[PDB]
């Protein structure tokens, strides 16, 4: 038979399962809906464990629980009552004779000690993948260290006295590779010669690899605390979101640099090399799996000072023409063709971020916090499990890491990128429309000549790597 | 066979803007959503007995992408442009939306709505003769939505296809 | 894309969780932190088809020892490690083999025999051994370093491969 259990009075999680408490959806079960007690018992449950719902709850619950009462539960949780001795029992020690103790060895080894042990897993995860909690309560913090380091007995021992080293560890808070990277490739401007860096002395094969490193650096720093609960839309966002603001607002520099540089080359022959030259760092790119720069390569090239450019695209050689377009069908469709190749490529890969963004907002805006039954408001965790399968998902691919080497000015130089200058943001982009006027006028005005603005050759050496002994 | 309309909603972010295309596309009587799904996006509707598919675009949380905004804009046949009824900056916002509008499309003269969102019950700060009036002045029509009773919401996008077709 | 669900068993301190870390992240961890048990994705292109992994990572610890049949259950293939500086490990193996086979109920699971730490000179294990091992249950062996990440893709992809073939 099944074990008994404390009695719901003197342990609040013993409860029996009840459709007022707990809701499962239609070979682990996967619950809709719950108390948070029954959620808490879930999460630690005796007779399997799930760390994938470790990590969806980790990541969700401050929408239903605050940090304070989840380590109060969890404490609870922890300390389970044991049963006294059976009929059985009694009869040896009225006899002198030392009890087998049976139903209570069985308790001790099926129920208290994996549910301890998930309590403690849920108490290493936290502190290992959502550290955030405590370094915004450092009362919270004090509970935590308090808790793991007042448990008692040789069953646990080896994870609570880890447990303690890992907290410390985070308070005070290297890659290895199949290969060697790449050779660093140069084209006009030299190693050290910084002040000549541009769109067209850089090489373009470099060009996109620094900007890749930068990229998946910025990608990998988001955290999910800066996502759920929507707070990068929310007034407090630049507080809440920094990393995820820090990525974005790099995407957008580099689509208006791309601009800046097409639409300030007023010699059509210039131009046309300049628009080549982007379509070559976009080729790479795609190499590369860097889908956030092709996108930022694309935004470009259809922004209304670009996009009208059909004197400077009409040059533009066929098969280029052909890489453009298809990085332009990525975007088709609600994005169809990206979500298809991103789920088949070899990583590493730098992801869009605006997808994911958009979908966790909807799952938060078009799913209700509560599901109503039997007079019981009970916790739509569905909703929950929803936005954690995003956060999931982008955190599946910020683990593996890029093999190229960082050249330091060249990231220097795209990290200082400030096209805007001090100019607002409406200025700054009516001023590109207004030079898009200017070097190809709006039928049916003629189209002016413009003299050359770059003394160097506009050659490219191409995108295919070279390679020295 | 039946004609399909894009139809593209713009306005400022965290004010609950989402809410409108949501209320559209769910199960009208079961408040849920997987966004993720193909095809939450597209609906099939019969507006004055002509049976036709509407195809919304709503890159609700990406407002900080500014430099795509052209891009997302470009697909769109209509557009609903939304504000919050609580939140004035948004509806100061209209203008330029509006004028990225003609300027993406290349024209003067772009099947658009003005939309009056409200998202929740802050105290109204935009009034209705205030929206009313700057419709007026753009000539387009003017729509206001409730964010949690659907009320306004199909209003919004069938007036916005009756533009389409008349213009 | 198909999925693939992997578990890595074996004794305390073999280098399970240091050889899934290395898979992951392509970092080497130094701490010994016991785990409870942790779980990881990866998407990767084997063999020209794209999948994705699901790795759970297991307790050796024996105070854990109660708690497997639940992750051998879920799981559709198995890493079996051991140290090849620990001959109790190795002498551990048999019991993680004859327990998914319990649980199973399958005389044929995908499995693949891990001797890892191969970096370290100081050897106790012969290959030989693990080698005889390994053809008596019908699965490759397969030696690795965490720390340098020699045979750690080998080991993981060659996993995959068999369950794909099962
Ligand atoms: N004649 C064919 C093929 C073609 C010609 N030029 C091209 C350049 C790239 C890809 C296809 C072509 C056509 O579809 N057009 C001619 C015009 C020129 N204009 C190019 C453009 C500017 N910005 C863009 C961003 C993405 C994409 Cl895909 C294209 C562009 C857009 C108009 C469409
Ligand atoms: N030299 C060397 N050390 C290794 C290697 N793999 C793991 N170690 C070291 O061995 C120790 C234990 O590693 P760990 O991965 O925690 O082992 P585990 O098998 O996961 N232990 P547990 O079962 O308790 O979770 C750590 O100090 C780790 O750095 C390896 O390939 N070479
Ligand atoms: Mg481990
Ligand atoms: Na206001």
Redesign the pocket.
Same mark, same amino acid.
Do not use: A, S, T
């Given at each position: 038979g099944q074990m008994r259990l404390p009695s719901a009075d003197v342990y609040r999680f013993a409860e029996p399962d009840s459709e007022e408490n707990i809701i499962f959806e239609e070979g682990i079960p996967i619950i809709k809906a719950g108390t948070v007690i029954k959620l808490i018992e879930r999460l630690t449950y005796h007779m399997y464990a799930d760390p994938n719902f470790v990590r969806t709850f980790l990541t969700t619950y401050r929408s239903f629980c605050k940090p304070q009462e989840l380590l109060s539960l969890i404490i609870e949780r922890f300390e389970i009552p044991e049963p006294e001795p059976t009929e059985a029992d009694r009869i040896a020690i009225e006899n002198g004779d030392q009890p087998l103790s049976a139903e209570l060895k069985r308790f001790r080894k099926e129920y208290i000690q994996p549910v301890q042990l998930r309590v403690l897993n849920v108490c290493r995860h936290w502190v290992e993948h959502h550290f955030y909690d405590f370094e915004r309560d450092a009362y919270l913090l004090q509970r935590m260290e308090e808790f793991i380091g007042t448990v008692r007995g040789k069953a646990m021992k080896k994870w609570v006295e880890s447990i303690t080293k890992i907290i410390q560890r985070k308070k005070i808070a290297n890659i290895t590779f199949q290969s060697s990277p790449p050779t660093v490739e140069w084209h006009i401007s030299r190693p050290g010669h910084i002040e000549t860096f541009d769109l067209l002395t850089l090489h373009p094969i470099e060009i996109a690899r620094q900007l890749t490193l930068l990229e998946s650096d910025l990608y990998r720093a988001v955290q999910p605390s800066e996502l759920v609960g929507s707070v990068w839309t929310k007034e407090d966002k630049e507080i809440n979101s920094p990393n995820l603001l820090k990525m974005i607002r790099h995407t957008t520099n580099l689509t208006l640099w791309f601009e800046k540089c097409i639409v300030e080359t007023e010699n059509l022959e210039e131009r046309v090399a300049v628009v080549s030259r982007i379509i070559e760092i976009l080729q790479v790119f795609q190499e590369l799996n860097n889908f956030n720069g092709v996108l930022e390569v694309?935004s470009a090239?259809?922004s209304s000072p670009?996009?009208r =450019?059909?004197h400077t695209?009409?040059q533009?050689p066929s098969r280029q023409?052909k890489i =453009?377009?298809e990085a332009?069908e990525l975007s088709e469709d609600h994005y169809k063709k990206y979500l298809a190749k991103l789920r088949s490529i070899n990583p590493p890969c730098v992801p869009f971020f605006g997808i994911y963004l958009t979908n966790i907002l909807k799952t938060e805006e078009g799913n209700p916090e509560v599901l109503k039954r039997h007079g019981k408001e009970l916790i739509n965790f569905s909703k929950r499990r929803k936005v954690a399968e995003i956060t999931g998902e982008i955190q599946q691919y910020q683990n593996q890491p890029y093999c190229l080497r960082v050249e330091s000015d060249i990231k220097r130089f795209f990290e200082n990128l400030n096209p805007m200058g001090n100019s607002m943001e409406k200025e700054f982009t009516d001023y590109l429309f207004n030079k898009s006027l200017e070097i190809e006028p709006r039928n049916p005005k003629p189209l002016p000549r413009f003299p050359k603005k770059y003394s160097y050759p506009l050659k490219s050496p191409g995108v295919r790597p070279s390679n020295p002994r | 066979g039946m004609t399909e309309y894009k139809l593209v909603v713009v306005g400022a972010g965290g004010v609950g803007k989402s809410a409108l295309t949501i209320q559209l596309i769910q199960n009208h009587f079961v408040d849920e959503y997987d966004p993720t799904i193909e095809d939450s996006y597209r609906k099939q509707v019969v507006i004055d007995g002509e049976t036709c598919l509407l195809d919304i675009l709503d890159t609700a949380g990406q407002e900080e992408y500014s430099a795509m905004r052209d891009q997302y804009m470009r697909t769109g046949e209509g557009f609903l442009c939304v504000f919050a009824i609580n939140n004035t900056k948004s509806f100061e916002d209209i203008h330029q939306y509006r004028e990225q509008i003609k300027r993406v499309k290349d024209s003067d003269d772009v099947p658009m709505v003005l939309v009056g969102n409200k998202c929740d019950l802050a105290a109204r700060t935009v009034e209705s003769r205030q929206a009313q009036d700057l419709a007026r002045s753009y000539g387009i029509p003017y729509i206001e939505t409730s964010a949690k009773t659907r009320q306004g919401v199909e209003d919004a996008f069938y007036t916005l296809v009756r533009e389409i077709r008349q213009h």
């Open positions: 694309v090239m259809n670009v996009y =450019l059909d695209f009409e533009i023409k =453009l377009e332009h | -």
